[PDB]
Curated annotation (Swiss-Prot), chain B:
Residues 1-174, 175-367, 368-565 form the Albumin domain. Its main location: secreted. This is Albumin. It comes from Homo sapiens. The record marks K187 as: Aspirin-acetylated lysine. Binds water, Ca(2+), Na(+), K(+), fatty acids, hormones, bilirubin and drugs. Its main function is the regulation of the colloidal osmotic pressure of blood. Major zinc transporter in plasma, typically binds about 80% of all plasma zinc. Major calcium and magnesium transporter in plasma, binds approximately 45% of circulating calcium and magnesium in plasma. Potentially has more than two calcium-binding sites and might additionally bind calcium in a non-specific manner. Changing H116R: In Komagome-2. The modification Phosphoserine is found at S2, S55, S62, S261, S407, S477. Keywords: Calcium, Cleavage on pair of basic residues, Copper, Disease variant, Disulfide bond, Glycation, Glycoprotein, Lipid-binding, Metal-binding, Methylation, Phosphoprotein, Repeat, Secreted, Signal, Zinc. Zn(2+) binds at H64, H235, D237.
């Protein structure tokens, strides 16, 4: 079975940074493009970032361009999101998904950015 | 405890005894009938000691141990080896083309008398002769052929005109035996050369076409059980194959509501009739208005997540979904589409944006669907113009030019079999033509691959046979004329026939002319269809004229020299 476990969320001030981790198990991690998606309260889900299986190709939503960096460690089967200059608008549950799936298949991790 | 006792109990003395005879005949094909009958009797008396007392010595042994030990009392390299290597050695030595006496049937009076005088010996000789000629014959269906071979003699030996009753039935059984044998030979080549995944994929496609109202989970269960049946039969595990086949027929008939509406009459019949009936049953009606596959397989952004959970189950579901909707497609076509889909997910699921690169995969299917459709259309039109015999000649020339290193008898046999597609498929409506034509062609090209395997002289036959089971037909179709082949020398004897040619059947005279045509092409591979048609028309004309003459031997001699002369005139020495 595929298992995805997110951590690194927290309650943080605007302008602070957070690094999220996604521990992936039950598949050849390196063969699969991976994604971060977020669910803010009272908003549609929002695709954030995708990374090719190699780590060579990278995509971002305009809402996070220049602030967030996606990366992966194939050896540790782990996906990362480096989130800098965080904003109130960034408040959401962050979840990693395989290959651009929009549906949450994991506990996720809460990020609250408080004015 | 005792496996031999278990099987003996499960199948009963008669089918146990028939199945051991078949096993021994398939392993030692050159061994005399009398010698096999003795080995079977010995093993059978033993099995009964094991039935009566399970702890009796050597009843705890594996079937392979017991059966190989008995075989080894009469056998060569393989008897020096030990289980499991011994069984593998026996399997490896099965001969697809044994050098055996071509089997002739006596007068109907002789045969009917033999049947009355020695019924059991007469039916055991049938099993023995079929099994040693066809070492991959599906053992449980061979039990059924024997049952029908008995009913033929029982009826027809009472009849007013025996020969009129009996001969058309022995001809139907003989013809259906060769079809059953060729089909089983392809199942075994799939398991042994391409592995259980290859066969499972074949089974998912075929059962999904037949049982389209069945749930995926039902179809998977049947695929599991059917794969186990053919793995055992193709590995020489014949007692457990027949046992497990009887159990699958039982399961299917007890779950008709989960599987098909067409099983009712099959599931009334006795065990051997029922198994055969189920295996050949018509495709059920499709559930009405099934949706497009695009939504869950190409437009969904969940394709790679779903792939990731279970690659083979997700690809299984795709094949099941595609196959149940297309009774009008060949099984090899459906396997080519699924294999395309799979290679698309392997590339695409590693992309930052998998949806972007797999979104047009159904575009890739269009040419894959059209190519077989255009091949059948094109070859059925030629068939309608030429008729069977001349259609065979067209395919002979085509294949001799593709793979001229192949043996003449192999080219003639395979090309004749290729040409029978016309009569067996081209009469069907275009909704039945593709599975009829293309799955039949897969069976015949497997015959080419196995006749060529022992001494693989044609690199291009080896490539087409080994690269991809499911691409075999397209691979052969795409082969160009071989420009590299060095022409062989022409023996004059090729066109020099004798008087007794007039006494042969129409079929034998055609084979003689087809043999000569191959020998021509191998000598003059640049020869035009028009030039080969002239030569072949003169050949026909010379045999008709010479078979009418008073001095036939003279006529053939002279006309041979004329034909060679005319030949060399048109195409050269």
């Amino acid at each position: 079975e595929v298992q995805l476990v997110e951590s690194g969320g927290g309650l943080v001030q605007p302008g602070n940074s957070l690094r999220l981790s996604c521990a992936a198990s039950g598949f050849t991690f390196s063969s699969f493009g991976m994604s971060w998606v977020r669910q803010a309260p009272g908003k549609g889900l929002e695709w954030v970032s995708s990374i090719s299986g190699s780590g060579s190709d990278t995509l971002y939503a305009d809402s996070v361009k220049g602030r967030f960096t996606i990366s992966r460690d194939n050896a540790k089967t782990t996906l990362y999101l480096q989130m800098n200059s965080l904003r109130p608008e960034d408040t959401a549950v962050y979840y990693c998904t395989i290959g651009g799936s929009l549906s949450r298949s994991s506990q996720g991790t809460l990020v609250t950015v408080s004015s | 405890k005792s496996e031999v006792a278990h099987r003996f109990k499960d199948l009963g003395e008669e089918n146990f005894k028939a199945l051991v005879l078949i096993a021994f005949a398939q392993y030692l094909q050159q061994c005399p009938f009398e010698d096999h009958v003795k080995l079977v009797n010995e093993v059978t008396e033993f099995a009964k000691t094991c039935v009566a007392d399970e702890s009796a010595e050597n009843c705890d042994k594996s079937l392979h141990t017991l059966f190989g030990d008995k075989l080894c009392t009469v056998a060569a390299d393989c008897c020096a080896k030990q289980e499991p290597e011994r069984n593998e050695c026996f399997l490896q030595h099965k001969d697809d083309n044994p050098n055996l006496p071509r089997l002739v049937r006596p007068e109907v009076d002789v045969m009917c008398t033999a049947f009355h005088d020695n019924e059991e010996t007469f039916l055991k000789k049938y099993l023995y002769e079929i099994a040693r000629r066809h070492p991959y014959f599906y053992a449980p269906e061979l039990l059924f052929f024997a049952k029908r071979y008995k009913a033929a003699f029982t009826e027809c030996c009472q009849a007013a005109d025996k020969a009129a009753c009996l001969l058309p039935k022995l001809d139907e059984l003989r013809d259906e035996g060769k079809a059953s044998s060729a089909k089983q030979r392809l199942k075994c080549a799939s398991l042994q050369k391409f592995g259980e995944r290859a066969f499972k994929a074949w089974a998912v496609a075929r059962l999904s076409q037949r049982f389209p109202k069945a749930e995926f989970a039902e179809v998977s269960k049947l695929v599991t059980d059917l794969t186990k049946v053919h793995t055992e039969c193709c590995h020489g595990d014949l007692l457990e194959c027949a046992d497990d086949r009887a159990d699958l027929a039982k399961y299917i008939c007890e779950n008709q509501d989960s599987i098909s509406s067409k099983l009712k009459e099959c599931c009334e019949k006795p065990l051997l009739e029922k198994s055969h009936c189920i295996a050949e049953v018509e495709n059920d009606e499709m559930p009405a208005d099934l949706p497009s596959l695009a939504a869950d397989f190409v437009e969904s952004k969940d394709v790679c997540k779903n792939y990731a959970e279970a690659k083979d189950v997700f690809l299984g579901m795709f094949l099941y979904e595609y196959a149940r909707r297309h009774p009008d497609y060949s099984v090899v076509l459906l396997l080519r589409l699924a294999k395309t889909y799979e290679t698309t997910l392997e590339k695409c699921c590693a992309a930052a944006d998998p949806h972007e690169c797999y979104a047009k995969v159904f575009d890739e299917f269009k040419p894959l669907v059209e190519e077989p459709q255009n091949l059948i259309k094109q070859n059925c039109e030629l068939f309608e113009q030429l008729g069977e015999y001349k259609f065979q000649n067209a395919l002979l020339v085509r294949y001799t030019k593709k793979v001229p290193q192949v043996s003449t008898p192999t080219l003639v046999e395979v090309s004749r079999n290729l040409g029978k597609v016309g009569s067996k498929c081209c009469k069907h409506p275009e909704a039945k033509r593709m599975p009829c034509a293309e799955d039949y062609l897969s069976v015949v090209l497997n015959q080419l691959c196995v006749l060529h395997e022992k001494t693989p002289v044609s690199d291009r036959v080896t490539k087409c046979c080994t690269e991809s089971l499911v691409n075999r037909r397209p691979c052969f179709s795409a082969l160009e004329v071989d420009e590299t082949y060095v022409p062989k020398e022409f023996n004059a004897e090729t066109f020099t026939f004798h008087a007794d040619i007039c006494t042969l059947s129409e079929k034998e005279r055609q084979i003689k002319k087809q043999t000569a045509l191959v020998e021509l092409v191998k000598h003059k591979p640049k020869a035009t269809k028009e030039q080969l048609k002239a030569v072949m028309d003169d050949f026909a004309a010379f045999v008709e004229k010479c078979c009418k003459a008073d001095d036939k031997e003279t006529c053939f001699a002279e006309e041979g020299k004329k034909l060679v002369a005319a030949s060399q005139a048109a195409l050269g020495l």
